Structures are given as C-alpha cells and as structure tokens.
Scaffold this active site. Sequence first.
Site, PDB file in Angstrom:
ATOM      1  N   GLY A  37       0.833  -1.208   0.000  1.00  0.00           N
ATOM      2  CA  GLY A  37       0.000   0.000   0.000  1.00  0.00           C
ATOM      3  C   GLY A  37       0.854   1.238   0.000  1.00  0.00           C
ATOM      4  O   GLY A  37       2.080   1.155   0.244  1.00  0.00           O
ATOM      5  N   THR A  38       0.230   2.346  -0.334  1.00  0.00           N
ATOM      6  CA  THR A  38       0.890   3.656  -0.363  1.00  0.00           C
ATOM      7  C   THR A  38       0.139   4.528   0.625  1.00  0.00           C
ATOM      8  O   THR A  38      -1.076   4.545   0.568  1.00  0.00           O
ATOM      9  CB  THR A  38       0.992   4.190  -1.789  1.00  0.00           C
ATOM     10  OG1 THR A  38       1.951   3.370  -2.461  1.00  0.00           O
ATOM     11  CG2 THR A  38       1.423   5.639  -1.808  1.00  0.00           C
ATOM     12  N   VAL A  44       3.933   1.106   2.366  1.00  0.00           N
ATOM     13  CA  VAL A  44       3.979  -0.042   3.291  1.00  0.00           C
ATOM     14  C   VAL A  44       4.404  -1.248   2.478  1.00  0.00           C
ATOM     15  O   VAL A  44       3.719  -1.567   1.498  1.00  0.00           O
ATOM     16  CB  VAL A  44       2.653  -0.251   4.019  1.00  0.00           C
ATOM     17  CG1 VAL A  44       2.779  -1.380   5.016  1.00  0.00           C
ATOM     18  CG2 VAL A  44       2.179   1.029   4.668  1.00  0.00           C
ATOM     19  N   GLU A 108       3.442  -5.663  12.985  1.00  0.00           N
ATOM     20  CA  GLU A 108       2.857  -7.005  12.816  1.00  0.00           C
ATOM     21  C   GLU A 108       1.998  -6.992  11.547  1.00  0.00           C
ATOM     22  O   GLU A 108       1.226  -6.040  11.317  1.00  0.00           O
ATOM     23  CB  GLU A 108       2.057  -7.346  14.061  1.00  0.00           C
ATOM     24  CG  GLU A 108       1.369  -8.672  13.962  1.00  0.00           C
ATOM     25  CD  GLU A 108       0.644  -8.989  15.251  1.00  0.00           C
ATOM     26  OE1 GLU A 108       1.119  -9.896  15.978  1.00  0.00           O
ATOM     27  OE2 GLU A 108      -0.344  -8.281  15.546  1.00  0.00           O
ATOM     28  N   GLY A 112      -6.226  -8.132   7.203  1.00  0.00           N
ATOM     29  CA  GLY A 112      -7.584  -7.934   7.727  1.00  0.00           C
ATOM     30  C   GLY A 112      -8.400  -7.048   6.815  1.00  0.00           C
ATOM     31  O   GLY A 112      -8.254  -7.126   5.597  1.00  0.00           O
ATOM     32  N   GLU A 114     -10.781  -2.984   7.165  1.00  0.00           N
ATOM     33  CA  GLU A 114     -10.897  -1.692   7.887  1.00  0.00           C
ATOM     34  C   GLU A 114     -12.326  -1.645   8.395  1.00  0.00           C
ATOM     35  O   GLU A 114     -13.233  -1.988   7.627  1.00  0.00           O
ATOM     36  CB  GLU A 114     -10.514  -0.562   6.935  1.00  0.00           C
ATOM     37  CG  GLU A 114      -9.018  -0.538   6.624  1.00  0.00           C
ATOM     38  CD  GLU A 114      -8.103  -0.176   7.800  1.00  0.00           C
ATOM     39  OE1 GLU A 114      -8.620   0.310   8.866  1.00  0.00           O
ATOM     40  OE2 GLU A 114      -6.858  -0.351   7.661  1.00  0.00           O
ATOM     41  N   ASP A 153      -9.081  10.208  19.649  1.00  0.00           N
ATOM     42  CA  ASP A 153      -9.298  10.154  18.181  1.00  0.00           C
ATOM     43  C   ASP A 153     -10.092   8.914  17.781  1.00  0.00           C
ATOM     44  O   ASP A 153      -9.879   8.404  16.652  1.00  0.00           O
ATOM     45  CB  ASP A 153      -7.964  10.209  17.442  1.00  0.00           C
ATOM     46  CG  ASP A 153      -8.097  10.613  15.989  1.00  0.00           C
ATOM     47  OD1 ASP A 153      -9.089  11.280  15.672  1.00  0.00           O
ATOM     48  OD2 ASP A 153      -7.171  10.280  15.208  1.00  0.00           O
ATOM     49  N   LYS A 155     -12.745   6.647  16.077  1.00  0.00           N
ATOM     50  CA  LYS A 155     -13.616   6.699  14.894  1.00  0.00           C
ATOM     51  C   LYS A 155     -13.372   5.398  14.147  1.00  0.00           C
ATOM     52  O   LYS A 155     -12.300   4.824  14.262  1.00  0.00           O
ATOM     53  CB  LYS A 155     -13.355   7.928  14.005  1.00  0.00           C
ATOM     54  CG  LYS A 155     -11.901   8.156  13.607  1.00  0.00           C
ATOM     55  CD  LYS A 155     -11.618   9.367  12.704  1.00  0.00           C
ATOM     56  CE  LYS A 155     -10.138   9.426  12.357  1.00  0.00           C
ATOM     57  NZ  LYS A 155      -9.754  10.619  11.575  1.00  0.00           N
ATOM     58  N   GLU A 157     -12.497   4.821  11.214  1.00  0.00           N
ATOM     59  CA  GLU A 157     -11.302   4.988  10.348  1.00  0.00           C
ATOM     60  C   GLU A 157     -10.030   4.547  11.076  1.00  0.00           C
ATOM     61  O   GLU A 157      -9.047   4.212  10.409  1.00  0.00           O
ATOM     62  CB  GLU A 157     -11.178   6.460   9.950  1.00  0.00           C
ATOM     63  CG  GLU A 157     -12.243   6.923   8.964  1.00  0.00           C
ATOM     64  CD  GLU A 157     -13.551   7.451   9.534  1.00  0.00           C
ATOM     65  OE1 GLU A 157     -14.007   6.990  10.649  1.00  0.00           O
ATOM     66  OE2 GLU A 157     -14.143   8.348   8.860  1.00  0.00           O
ATOM     67  N   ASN A 158     -10.018   4.587  12.417  1.00  0.00           N
ATOM     68  CA  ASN A 158      -8.821   4.242  13.219  1.00  0.00           C
ATOM     69  C   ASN A 158      -8.879   2.800  13.745  1.00  0.00           C
ATOM     70  O   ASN A 158      -8.060   2.462  14.640  1.00  0.00           O
ATOM     71  CB  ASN A 158      -8.643   5.256  14.347  1.00  0.00           C
ATOM     72  CG  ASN A 158      -8.079   6.576  13.845  1.00  0.00           C
ATOM     73  OD1 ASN A 158      -7.660   6.670  12.678  1.00  0.00           O
ATOM     74  ND2 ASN A 158      -7.921   7.541  14.749  1.00  0.00           N
ATOM     75  N   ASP A 171      -3.998   4.067  15.103  1.00  0.00           N
ATOM     76  CA  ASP A 171      -3.482   5.454  14.997  1.00  0.00           C
ATOM     77  C   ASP A 171      -3.353   6.046  16.411  1.00  0.00           C
ATOM     78  O   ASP A 171      -4.311   5.926  17.198  1.00  0.00           O
ATOM     79  CB  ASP A 171      -4.398   6.285  14.115  1.00  0.00           C
ATOM     80  CG  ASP A 171      -3.897   7.673  13.773  1.00  0.00           C
ATOM     81  OD1 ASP A 171      -3.271   8.344  14.643  1.00  0.00           O
ATOM     82  OD2 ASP A 171      -4.167   8.086  12.645  1.00  0.00           O
ATOM     83  N   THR A 188     -11.934  14.531  15.110  1.00  0.00           N
ATOM     84  CA  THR A 188     -12.739  14.775  13.909  1.00  0.00           C
ATOM     85  C   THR A 188     -14.044  15.368  14.397  1.00  0.00           C
ATOM     86  O   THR A 188     -14.545  15.001  15.474  1.00  0.00           O
ATOM     87  CB  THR A 188     -12.840  13.496  13.066  1.00  0.00           C
ATOM     88  OG1 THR A 188     -13.309  13.887  11.781  1.00  0.00           O
ATOM     89  CG2 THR A 188     -13.805  12.483  13.621  1.00  0.00           C
TER      90      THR A 188
HETATM   91  N1  LIG Z   1      -0.027  -4.086   9.512  1.00  0.00           N
HETATM   92  C1  LIG Z   1      -0.337  -4.139   8.217  1.00  0.00           C
HETATM   93  N2  LIG Z   1      -0.441  -5.352   7.621  1.00  0.00           N
HETATM   94  C2  LIG Z   1      -0.738  -5.400   6.313  1.00  0.00           C
HETATM   95  N3  LIG Z   1      -0.974  -4.404   5.457  1.00  0.00           N
HETATM   96  C3  LIG Z   1      -0.869  -3.214   6.072  1.00  0.00           C
HETATM   97  C4  LIG Z   1      -0.562  -3.003   7.406  1.00  0.00           C
HETATM   98  N4  LIG Z   1      -0.537  -1.637   7.676  1.00  0.00           N
HETATM   99  C5  LIG Z   1      -0.823  -1.059   6.531  1.00  0.00           C
HETATM  100  N5  LIG Z   1      -1.032  -1.965   5.515  1.00  0.00           N
HETATM  101  C6  LIG Z   1      -1.376  -1.646   4.110  1.00  0.00           C
HETATM  102  O1  LIG Z   1      -0.877  -0.357   3.791  1.00  0.00           O
HETATM  103  C7  LIG Z   1      -1.945   0.469   3.252  1.00  0.00           C
HETATM  104  C8  LIG Z   1      -1.695   1.952   3.471  1.00  0.00           C
HETATM  105  O2  LIG Z   1      -1.026   2.222   4.746  1.00  0.00           O
HETATM  106  P1  LIG Z   1      -1.718   3.030   5.970  1.00  0.00           P
HETATM  107  O3  LIG Z   1      -0.873   2.857   7.190  1.00  0.00           O
HETATM  108  O4  LIG Z   1      -3.161   2.646   6.058  1.00  0.00           O
HETATM  109  O5  LIG Z   1      -1.662   4.594   5.565  1.00  0.00           O
HETATM  110  P2  LIG Z   1      -1.867   5.987   6.368  1.00  0.00           P
HETATM  111  O6  LIG Z   1      -0.659   6.784   5.954  1.00  0.00           O
HETATM  112  O7  LIG Z   1      -2.035   5.645   7.824  1.00  0.00           O
HETATM  113  N6  LIG Z   1      -3.261   6.674   5.799  1.00  0.00           N
HETATM  114  P3  LIG Z   1      -4.536   7.270   6.664  1.00  0.00           P
HETATM  115  O8  LIG Z   1      -4.947   6.274   7.728  1.00  0.00           O
HETATM  116  O9  LIG Z   1      -5.750   7.583   5.802  1.00  0.00           O
HETATM  117  O10 LIG Z   1      -4.174   8.543   7.388  1.00  0.00           O
HETATM  118  C9  LIG Z   1      -3.205  -0.124   3.892  1.00  0.00           C
HETATM  119  O11 LIG Z   1      -4.379   0.194   3.153  1.00  0.00           O
HETATM  120  C10 LIG Z   1      -2.887  -1.624   3.862  1.00  0.00           C
HETATM  121  O12 LIG Z   1      -3.209  -2.232   2.629  1.00  0.00           O
END
Ligand SMILES: Nc1ncnc2c1ncn2[C@@H]1O[C@H](COP(=O)(O)OP(=O)(O)NP(=O)(O)O)[C@@H](O)[C@H]1O
EC number: 2.7.11.11
Lengths: 326, 206
Positions: A37-38, A44, A108, A112, A114, A153, A155, A157-158, A171, A188
């Site tokens: 993911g980005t 990530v 870890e 899963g 969201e 925080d 919600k 989303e977290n 978060d 929020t």
């Molecule tokens: N522990 C994890 N295990 C597997 N995949 C992960 C994990 N953490 C993040 N990812 C992947 O990485 C993607 C993007 O990283 P993420 O940490 O969600 O971004 P962010 O910078 O926190 N964005 P936001 O929550 O909207 O502020 C996620 O949608 C997952 O697909």
Amino acid sequence: AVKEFLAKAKEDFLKKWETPSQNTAQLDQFDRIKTLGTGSFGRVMLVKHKESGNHYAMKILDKQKVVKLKQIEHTLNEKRILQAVNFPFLVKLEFSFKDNSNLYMVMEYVAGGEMFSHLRRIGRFSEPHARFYAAQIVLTFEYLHSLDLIYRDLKPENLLIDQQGYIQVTDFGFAKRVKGRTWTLCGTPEYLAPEIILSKGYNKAVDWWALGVLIYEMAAGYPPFFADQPIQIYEKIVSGKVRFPSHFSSDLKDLLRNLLQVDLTKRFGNLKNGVNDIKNHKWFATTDWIAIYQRKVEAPFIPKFYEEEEIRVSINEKCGKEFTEF
Amino acid sequence: NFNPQPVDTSNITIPEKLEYFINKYAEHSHDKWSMDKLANGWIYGEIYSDSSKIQPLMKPYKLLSEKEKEIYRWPIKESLKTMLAWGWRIERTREGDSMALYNRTRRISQTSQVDIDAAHGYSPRAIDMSNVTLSRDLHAMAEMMAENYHNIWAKKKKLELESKGGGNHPLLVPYDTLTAAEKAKDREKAQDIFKFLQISGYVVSR
Ligand SMILES: Nc1ncnc2c1ncn2[C@@H]1O[C@H](COP(=O)(O)OP(=O)(O)NP(=O)(O)O)[C@@H](O)[C@H]1O
Ligand SMILES: [Cl-]
C-alpha cells in the site's frame, strides 16, 4: 491477582515511555517482498525478517514528506506510544529505526479489513455485532486510561478488523499522557466531546463520549451529530440533543444516554465506579469481559485473505533535528 | 361573482404529537429569517433601532418569547389546520432523513478553533430545500394549499372592503387567473411546508 498485572503492565509501560527504544533493527535485516500500500508519507512493504522468517508490514515514512505535511509531532508521538504499550486491541510495533531519508515502523502483518469500509459496505451492524466490537474498545480505554493516556481520536477509520475478526486501534498521533486536564483541539468534528468544543479544558472522559458516538454509528450506520458544515455539528453536540433510531433497543438507548452525556460529571466511565458502570450496564449483560480480553469469543466477521520501485536512502542526513527522538 | 370560501379551521384541534414538527419548522423559519437579515446587512443588537440596521430578534429561537415565536408558530398551525379540515392525514413515517443526507466519506481528524469559536455564537444555516422534490400528487396538494392561502387573503380583503364601502384590489380574482409571479408567494409558502414535512419524516396523504 488482579492488583499484580495492573501494577506490572503500568511499570513496563512507564519504563519504555520514559526511555524509548530506538533503532531496534536495520534495513539489511529484511527481505523486501512487495508493496502492500501507499500512505501519506511513503509506502507499506511486505518484508521477511531474515533471521526469524516472520513477515511484517514495514511502513516507510519519508522524513521530508512528514515535515511538509506538518505531521512531525504526531509521527513521533505515535511511535513513542506504540513502543511502550501492549494490549490485545492495539497494533503491534515489532521494530523501529531511521536512516538518512526515512523512518521505519515494522508492524505485525495483519491481512484484515478496515472497520470504516466494512461498516459503510454492510450499512449498519446488529446490536450483538456492535456490542462485540464495543467491548474491545471498553477494555482498550480501561487499559489506556490506567496509563493516564487519553486516546482522543476514536472513529471507525482508526480501527482495523484483524485476521480473527477482532479490532485493533491503528493510529496514536493525538494520544496524550496526562494527569487531569488538557486543552488541545483535536479529533474529527463528528466525534468531538462537548467539553472539547467549550474550549475550557477536558480529561479522559472525552474517550467515553467518543465510545457513545462509535456505538451509535455502528448500530445506526450514521453518527448522532452531523451536518453539511462543522459549525452546525459543534452546535448539535453542545446543544445536548440526540435522537435514537426507532430500531435501537431500550437497553442501547439507556447506555447511550449515559455515554452521550453532555455533562462530563455525569458521564458513564467518569463516575466513582469508573469503567464498571459501562461493563455492568444491561446492554452488556451477555458480554463475557474476560473471554473478549482473551479473544476466545467467535467474531461475527472474518476478513477474506513490474510494480516495484527501489528504496533510495540518501547519502546526506535529512531532517536530523525534527526526528532526533525517533 | 368571486366568492372565496377557504375551509373553516376555527374548530380544528391539532393533535399534540404534531408539536414536535411545529417547533422544528418554526425554528427553521426563524433561522431562514435571520440568514436573510444578515445577507441584507442587518446585525444583532440588544436594543432595537431601524437606524444602522440593528435587530434584537437576530438571536437563537430558544431565547425568543412566546409572542416572538408565535410569528412563526401561528401560520404553521393555520397551515396544518387547513390540511386536517380537508380530512388529510399527517403521519410521521421515519426520522428526519438522517442516513440519506449523511456524507459517508472517510473523515480526517482536522478541526479549526475558528469554527469552534463561531459555534459559541448565533450562526444560522437553515437547510436549503432547493434539491427536495415533491411527487406529482404532493405537488397538486401543495397547489391546493397555495390556492387556499390566496382565498384566505381574498376573503379577509373582501370583508375589509365590504366593511368600509370602498376599496378595490386587482388580485381579488380566482387564484388560477393569477400569473405565476402573482401565485409565487402562496406557491413558495405551500411548497415550503410540504418540503419541510417530507425532510422531517412526515407523509401527507388524502
Ligand atoms: N499491519 C499491516 N499489515 C498489512 N498491510 C498493512 C498493514 N498496515 C498497513 N497496511 C497496508 O498499507 C496500506 C496503506 O497504509 P496506511 O498505514 O493505512 O496509511 P496511512 O498513511 O495511515 N493513511 P490514513 O490512515 O488515511 O491517514 C493499507 O491500506 C494496507 O493495505
Ligand atoms: Cl383533496
């Protein structure tokens, strides 16, 4: 018995909090498999720790991007919290390090879902399903509060839904260690407790308010206070008016009357009996608190199980000052 | 021959359960009034003065007296009484359309002290019901209410002139002979109450 762990959990947290671990791994100790993911700050990556063979999700944060997006303090605070806490419903930081260009948070690996996208796709959760997720937040806030942490925080989303369908808080940018009162405006709009809006200081009771908002939103499919613009949301929150869907049970409405209580001095979780006013509420009668903690309850939803660009690490240290504590 | 006879509502009792709607619509109407006063360059002021455009009623609905609330409540009740005198049914079908209107987009943890401070004051933003559509049948019912508002005005006006032995108004004519521009006020009042009933979870039926 009960006194033994609550004291020991707190001593282990305080030691790590006061002296955080730094550079507990390095980049050459991981095989880079692929990008998962980005994020805001970078990518990530799925990585394999060479010695153990374990897979991890390595979050790579470009320091320059964290500075530009003004997320310095949030990033440092989140890592400081994650290297000190240990609880079943908090994401697990396994290693952290930094180099000239990046911060690295080796998490870890969790294949899963969201909570946000699941809830929006399903529309709304039944009371039994909402109760299952709510119980995990109640135990998580009991834990955080025992360490004097205000989460502030909550919600959907977290919250991720993990491989066994339990939730994990993901978060910790805003969480603060504080005894008594604090003032920073954060969160929020839809989840702000009235005492935040009133801007005269607040305490950990804002978390119990937010629990009320999350339970309402899970059971209804929309939160209790909303509007096209924030000012009108703030007005509704302090207004002390809420309307429950006619499908809410009488037990759910009673709990939410006591959690969405505008007067923090009468709010459940903030009285003499603390978390037990919530745990022993009729809406939680069917909840086995220890079995939730031990993750022995069967969850209602189990999530379904040339792109590469290379990591370039600069020769010159970037943002050394801003991330010195990382 | 023009003999406007709007239905007599003198013996109608509004069911107590409609109090919820009357209060909600009265507050919406007051907020809409205040917004329009802010947009024409009026401002709150403790003591009234037409000079410099100061209006002490430009405050939250809950602070208004009974008398000041009645400016909104009286016509709303008159509107509901007409519908009930026609044997129309007014039933609360759901809640105030929460889900459909809720923005379900992912939320960022971004807050502004500027918004927070503004929320301590009177900051009216009545819903814009411009998007809200009426069914074919509910449009026809709204047109009948519009016509009845004209007939209420017309009968009152006619009795006034008959009482004096003098006066003449060119709009003392059947409602349908009016131009769109002449109907617009009664149309907008009728459509406003039907639209607000709808968003508030009520169904009017006949
Ligand atoms: N522990 C994890 N295990 C597997 N995949 C992960 C994990 N953490 C993040 N990812 C992947 O990485 C993607 C993007 O990283 P993420 O940490 O969600 O971004 P962010 O910078 O926190 N964005 P936001 O929550 O909207 O502020 C996620 O949608 C997952 O697909
Ligand atoms: Cl009819």
